[PDB]
Amino acid sequence: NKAISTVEPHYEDTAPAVEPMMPGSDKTPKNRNEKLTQLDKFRFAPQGESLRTNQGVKISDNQNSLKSGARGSTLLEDFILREKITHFDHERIPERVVHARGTGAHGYFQVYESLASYTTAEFLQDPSVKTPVFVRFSTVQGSRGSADTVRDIRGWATKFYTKEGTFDLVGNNTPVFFIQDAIKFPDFVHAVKPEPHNEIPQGQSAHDTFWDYISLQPETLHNVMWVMSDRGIPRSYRMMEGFGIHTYKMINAEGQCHFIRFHWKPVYGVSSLIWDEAQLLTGCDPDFHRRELWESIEAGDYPEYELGLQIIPEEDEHKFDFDILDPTKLIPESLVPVHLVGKMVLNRNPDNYFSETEQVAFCPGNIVPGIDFSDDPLLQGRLFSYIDTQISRLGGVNFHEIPINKPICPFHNHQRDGMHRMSISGTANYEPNSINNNWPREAPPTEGGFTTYPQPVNGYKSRKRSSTFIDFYSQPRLFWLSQTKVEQNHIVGGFSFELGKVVRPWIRERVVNQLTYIDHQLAQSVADNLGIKLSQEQLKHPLPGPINGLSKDRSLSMYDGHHQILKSRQVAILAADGVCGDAIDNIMKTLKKYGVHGKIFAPHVGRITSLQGNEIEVNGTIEGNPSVMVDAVIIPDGEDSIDSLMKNGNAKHYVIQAFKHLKAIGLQGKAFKLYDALPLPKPDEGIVVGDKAADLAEAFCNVMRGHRIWSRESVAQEIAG
Amino acid sequence: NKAISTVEPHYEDTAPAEKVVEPMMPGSDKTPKNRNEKLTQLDKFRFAPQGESLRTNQGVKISDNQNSLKSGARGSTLLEDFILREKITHFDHERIPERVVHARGTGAHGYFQVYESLASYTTAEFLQDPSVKTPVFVRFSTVQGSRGSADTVRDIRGWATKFYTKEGTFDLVGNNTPVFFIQDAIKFPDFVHAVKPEPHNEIPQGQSAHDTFWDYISLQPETLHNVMWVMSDRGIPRSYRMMEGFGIHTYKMINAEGQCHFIRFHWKPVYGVSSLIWDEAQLLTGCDPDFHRRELWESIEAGDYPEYELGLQIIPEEDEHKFDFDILDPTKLIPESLVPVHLVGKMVLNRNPDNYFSETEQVAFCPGNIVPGIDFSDDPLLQGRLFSYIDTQISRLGGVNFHEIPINKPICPFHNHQRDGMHRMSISGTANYEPNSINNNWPREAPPTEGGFTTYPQPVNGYKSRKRSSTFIDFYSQPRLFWLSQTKVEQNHIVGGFSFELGKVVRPWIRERVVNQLTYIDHQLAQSVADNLGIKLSQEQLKHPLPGPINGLSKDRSLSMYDGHHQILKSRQVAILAADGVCGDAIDNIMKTLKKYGVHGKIFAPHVGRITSLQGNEIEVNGTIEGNPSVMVDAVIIPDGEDSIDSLMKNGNAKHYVIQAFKHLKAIGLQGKAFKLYDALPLPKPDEGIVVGDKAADLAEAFCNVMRGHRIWSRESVAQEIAG
C-alpha cells in the first residue's frame, strides 16, 4: 500500500519532520550588487506551486506515460511526456573549445583612488562605486567533465559590469602565453588536446603531440617553464596570481596613452600543490577547486584580489630588451613595478550553474572607453575569436540577452532579429533616419563615445614575424634562475614525468635539446631522468644574457617571492570513538583563532563519542577524505581512538601520505604511538608532538605557516606510501 | 639561423633520420588488413596528406602558416586576412553538444557472425546466414559524467552495438547490468537529474555519491534492484572486454510465419567477467582517466580482440504470464536458471577508429532502429526510448541528415521521398512524393513477404490512462534474489559501496531513508551499512517483512560474478619491476613464460629508456614505476639482481608498489633477493598469493597459475589493516 503510493502521484509533503552546499540566494542573500539585482527577475520560487508543462498546464501524474491500459502501449498523444523528454533531450549545448572546465562566482570591484591621470574608464574613476563582477576560473585542455587539479594553465576571466559598458579582462594565471601570433592557436591547441585518433589523454599535456610541437616551436618554452613549475598546480583559485598578459593601452582625458599590463595579486597568498598530491586529488575529488571556491564563499573566506597595473609611458615602449607587444615576454616587476589600484571581492555563488557559469560569455574585444588595444599579434587575433565562437556555443547572435551576459547600462542600437530575440523594438532600424529623429544617436567622444587612439601605422602589408620577437630563451632562463632550489626540482620533475609518457624517443631528446639553451643543469637533470646521454656540444650550448641588466627576479618565485596565508586552510582531525573531547575542543578553538578549518574525519559518519561521553559531529570518513584534501593533519589523544586508528590501514596511510607530501602533522600524547609504529623516519620540524592540546595546536599552527616541510623532500622519496 | 627559421614557413622535413613500444595509431595505420564492408565504405572519406600542400578549405595553397597578415612586421592585423579568419573560424566551431547521457565513451569497429540460421524465430537477415560477416560499430560508455570524466568510475556502463545489415541498420542499445533503475520513461529526466551533478554548483563529476541521487533512490524503491548491481563490483569493470551486456528490455522476434517469441538480448564475453575493487578503481581514475579507452584500443592493437557471444532468452508468447514478475518490467531480470541464455552468434572488435570525432563522437544509436524480424514490446521504459534517440540527435548532430554522416550511413540502399534539411549531402532528382506517376512510383513500398517492415498485430485492450501496472509493484524480491546469490566477499563489496556512497551524503535523513529501504531487502545488509553510517536500526526495522522466492528461486548462480562466471588469464598485464643490475635471464624466462599464456609483461624501472642487466645487456623499459602504479596491472613480479633490489628498496614507489598490490588482493611473485624487499615492508607471512622461488621460469609458471583466481579474496580481512 505504501510501496504502491511511490508509483502514484505525490501530493503530500516529503520533507522530514555541517550544512550542504546551496545556491547563493539561499546561503548569502545579503551579499548583493547591481547585477545580482538585475538577475532576480529571472529567478523562480516553486514553493507552493503546481508542477506544470512549459505552457502553464498543471500536471496530475508525473509518474506514468499515457498508455492503452495500465499494461498497454504508450500513446503518441501524451504531450506531457513528449514535452518533458524533448526538453531533456536538448539540454546540452557545446562546451567551450578551450577552458571547457570552469567555475563561476559573483562579486564586486572597487578602485582605491581615481585613475583619471592614466585612463577615462568609468569603473576606474570613483572609489565609492561598487562595480559588479562575474569571474569564471578554468583549466584549459580538459573537457567539461575533466578534473580540477590537473597540471595546466588556469584561465581567469572577469566580467566588469560598468555604467558605460561591460568590460572583460580575460586572462590566465601566468604572465606569458605559449605562442606569439594568433594564427598558431589552433596548431598549439590541437597539439595539447587529446590526440585525434583515440581522444587520449584527458586533461594532460603529457603526450607525444604536445611535446612534438614544443620541440619545433621554441617560442613556447617560456610558458612551458611556468606550467612545468608548481604554478601549474595551484592549491586554490583563491591562491594564484592573474595576468591579462597582453599590453593594452590606457587613454586619459587629455588623449595621452600609457602602455598597461593588468595583474591580480591574491590577498590569500600564492600556494600550490605538489605533483603527486595533485594527481591523487584528481582521483579522490575531481571537483576540488570548484568545491573549495564554492565553500570558501559560504564560509566567509571570500576570494580577494588586488588589481595591479604596470604602467609604461608611450615614449618608453622601445627601451627594453624585449618587445612589450610580445605575449611570450613578461615585464619583470623589478624593472616595471605593479601599482595596486583596486580590489575585487568574490562573495556570492550562483543559483544555477548552467544559467550563469556555463552560459557566461567573455571576450577581450569587450573593452570600454579609456582602454584600447595594442598591436600584440596574439591579442589582435583573439579579438575576432570570442564573439565568433559564441555564435554556435550559445546558439546565435543574441547571447548578450542571456541574463548573465546583459550589461547593466543601456544598450540601444539598430541591430534586429537573430535567433531567440528577446527585445521588442518599435523604432527605426537604420541610421541615419529621420522618422525617429535619429534616436539612438552617435555619442561625441567628449560624451563617452568610444574612439580609437590614433596610433601611427607605417609599413608594408606582409606576413612576417617581427625580428624583435625572435628571443626564445632569455626569459625562460630568467624564470629558471629566479626559482628556489625546491622549485627548480619540481620543474625538473614536471618535464621528466611528462616526457616520461612520450612514446617517440626522438621527441624527448628534441625537448631536452631545447632545454640545453635555457640552463645546462636543467637539461642535464631532465636528461638523466629520461636515460638520455647529452653530448658535450650540448652541455656547451650558449646561454642568453641578462635582460636589462637582470638575471633574477624574486617576484617570479612562488615561495621566495610571495606570502603564504594561514587563514582559510584546512586541517584533518583524525579521531574515532574514545577520542579526548577536551583535546578536540582545544584544537578547534585554536584553529578557529587563526581562521583555519578543522574537519573531523572518523571511521564512520554521524557522531563519535568522546571518552568523556559527549557526542561529536563528524565531518566525513577517513576513507572518503584522504590526506590530499587537507593542508595538515592533527591526531588528538584518546586510548580507544588511537587503538581504533592503528587497526585502520587508511588512517595509518593518512599519516604516511601527508608525511610524504611534506605536510605538518600534529600528534597528541598516545597519538605518537601511531606515528612510531609506521615505517617513518623520526619526527622533524613538521612533526609537532605534545601532551597539552592547546599548546600543541598553537605550535602546529605555526608550522603550517611554512606551507610545506621542503627539507623533508629527500627522505620523502624513500617512503613507501 | 635555426631559431629565426622556426617562425618562418617550414618548407623542409621534420621527421628524424634513423638509428631508431609503438605509439597508439589510427586503425588504418596499425590494422589495415582487418576489413569489413563498412570500413570499405568509410575508405572513401579518408585522406593521405603525404606530399600535399597546406590549403584553405577552398583549395588555395598557403605560403606562410606562421604569421597573420599585418601592416608591417610589427603592425596591426588586417581584416583582409582570409587565411587567418578561415582557420580560426573553423577552430572556433569544432565542438558539438555532448550526449546528454553516456557522454563519455569509446568506439571500435568489428564484425558479427551468426552460428546457425535463426529462421524459426526471426526473419532478421543478419541472423539467417553463418557465412556473412555483418559489420558492427560498438560504443562503450559510462552514464553520468560529461565527455572528460574518468573511465573507471562507479557507474553503469553503456554498450551500444550498431549492426550494418543488408536490409537495414539495427541498433542494439544496452547496458552492462540486466535491469534498469526506473519502470517508466517519464521518470527518466528526474532520475538522470538526480544522479547528474547538482544544479547549483555542478558537483560531483562521475559519482552517484551525493544527496540528490540517494534522495531520489530513497523515494522511488523501484530503483533498488539496479542500485544493488551498481553498488556491487559490477559497477567497476576491469575492462570493457570483461563485462556482460544486456538489452534489458523484452523485445519480440517474428519469424516468416508471423509467430512471435518474447526475447531478451545478452552479451557474454569470451574473456570472462572481472571487476576492479573500489579503492583501486578510484586510484585508477586519478593516474589514468583514459584507462578503459586505452586498454580497449591497445587490446585491439595487440590482437587480444574483444570477443563476445550474442545470447537470447526466448519465451513463447504463451509463457508471458508464468513468472513471479512481469517480463515487461525493466527493473526485472529473467533468472538464467529459469530461462537459459542461448548463444547464437559471435561479435569480434578488430579495428580502432581513424578519427575519434568523425566515428566515435558522431555515431548515433537508437533502439527505434530495428529491422524486420524484430519488434517492440509494451515495456513502458522501452516505448519512451524510441522517441528520445532520434529527437536528441537533431541538436547533437546538427539536424535531420545525421544519417548521411559516414559512420551512420547504412550499407544497403535507402531511397525515399525525404529531402532537404541542414547539410543535405545526397542530390535527388526524382519525384519527392508517394504515390507519384511522373517517376512510376519509384521508390516503391515493399510487400511484407518481400521484407517490408510490419508490426506484429498484438491485441490492444484497455482504457486511455496514466497508471502504473499493478504487476510492476514488486520492488524488493529481485534485489533480495541478487543479494542472496553473491559470495560473502561480493556481499561485503556491496556493503562497502552503499557505505562509501552514503558517507558522502550530507543530509542525514536521506542516509537513514536509504538504510530503511535496505531493511526490506536483507536485514544483515541494512545492519552492516547502518553500522558504517552510525545509524542504529530499530527493533521494528529488523522485523520488516522480507519477500519470498521467485518461482521457487532464492539464489541464481549466474548473478554472482566470481562464483558464476569465468576468469580468463590471456590478455592480463603484469608489472615486472626492475632497475639497473637486474638478472637478465630472469626477465627473459619470465617474459617467455608470460608470452606462453598470452600475458603481457611490462618492465617498469626508475627511468624510461634502457636499463642494463648484470650480464651487461640493455633492456628497453615500458615506463617509469612512478608513471605506472600498481593499479594499472593485474599482478606484480620482481626478478632477481642484487643491484636491482638495492635500487628498488631505496625507491618509495617501488616499495609502495608491492604494498598496494598486496592490499588490492593481487598476486605477487618474488625471485631470490626480491623477497628481501618484501620482508622489509610491513607485510605479513607470505600467503597463497605470494609466490617465492629462485628459478625464474619455475616461479613464473606458479605465478601465472596464481593469476588464475583474479584476486586473492582470503587476504581481504588482513589487507584492511595494511598501511595503504
Ligand code: HEM
Ligand atoms: C594570452 C593568451 C590567451 C589567454 C590568456 C586566453 C584566455 C582565455 C580564457 C581565460 C578563456 C576562458 C573564458 C571563460 O571562462 O569563458 C578563453 C577562452 C577562449 N579563447 Fe582564449 N586566451 C588566449 C588566447 C587565445 C587565442 C589566441 C585564441 C584564438 C584566437 C583564443 C580563443 C579562445 C576561445 C575561442 C575561447 C572560448 C571562448 C568561449 O567559448 O566563450 N584565445 N581564453
Ligand code: HEM
Ligand atoms: C534500458 C534502459 C536504457 C538503456 C540500457 C539505455 C542505454 C543507452 C546507451 C548505451 C546510450 C549511449 C549510446 C551511445 O553510445 O551513443 C544511451 C544514450 C541515450 N539514451 Fe538511453 N538507455 C536507456 C534508457 C533511456 C531512457 C528511458 C531514455 C529517455 C527516454 C534514454 C535516452 C537516451 C538518450 C537521449 C541518449 C543519448 C543518445 C544520443 O545522444 O545519441 N535512454 N542509452
